Amino acid sequence: EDYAYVLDFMPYGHPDDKRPIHRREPLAQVVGERNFTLLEVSIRKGKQPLVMDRVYIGKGERDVVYKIKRRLRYEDLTPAAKTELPYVIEHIIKQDEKKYVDFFNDSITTRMHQLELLPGVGKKMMWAIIEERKKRPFESFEDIAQRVKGIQRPEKLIVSRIIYEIKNPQTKYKLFTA
Numbered sequence: 001e002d003y004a005y006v007l008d009f010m011p012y013g014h015p016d017d018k019r020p021i022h023r024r025e026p027l028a029q030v031v032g033e034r035n036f037t038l039l040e041v042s043i044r045k046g047k048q049p050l051v052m053d054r055v056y057i058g059k060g061e062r063d064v065v066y067k068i069k070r071r072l073r074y075e076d077l078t079p080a081a082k083t084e085l086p087y088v089i090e091h092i093i094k095q096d097e098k099k100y101v102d103f104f105n106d107s108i109t110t111r112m113h114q115l116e117l118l119p120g121v122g123k124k125m126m127w128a129i130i131e132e133r134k135k136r137p138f139e140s141f142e143d144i145a146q147r148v149k150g151i152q153r154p155e156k157l158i159v160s161r162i163i164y165e166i167k168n169p170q171t172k173y174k175l176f177t178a
Contacts, residue, residue, distance in 0.1 A: 001032030002058040005088045007081035009049045029081040032093035033092050036162050036177050038072040039101035041065045055070050074167045089159045120152050
């Protein structure tokens, strides 16, 4: 990951930190914009990151993040971070609609289609999506919600899958978190 989005900022770190206050550093939990990697990072002095802020976590000079502390499991996220996760992921995919709308217009597996990997998309829905794809490839999300009748917001479907993968690293297929 080169960039991540802020899920939660803790000026004094975790509330249960057992170390003396002067040794606690400001921390943020973030989600990578490419593979949705969950990370805990320290924040530089004088910075007050906001939820949804995009921060650089690459090898060059970092303006806000100090150090990357460790990769996190879904359970390691703070309550606030968990609440924000779906909203932040949705924000991320909307900033790169091209790549995801591309997923819809989508190889096959066997007796199971990839579209079915999306929570809220079963046999009926997948064929409905495939039937529309034939005519003309989708050019956006709104285009999908308008053409594919009764289909839940495509963004929500994507967010649901990403969250599913983040929670289940052992799942056999990693569509967006590989």
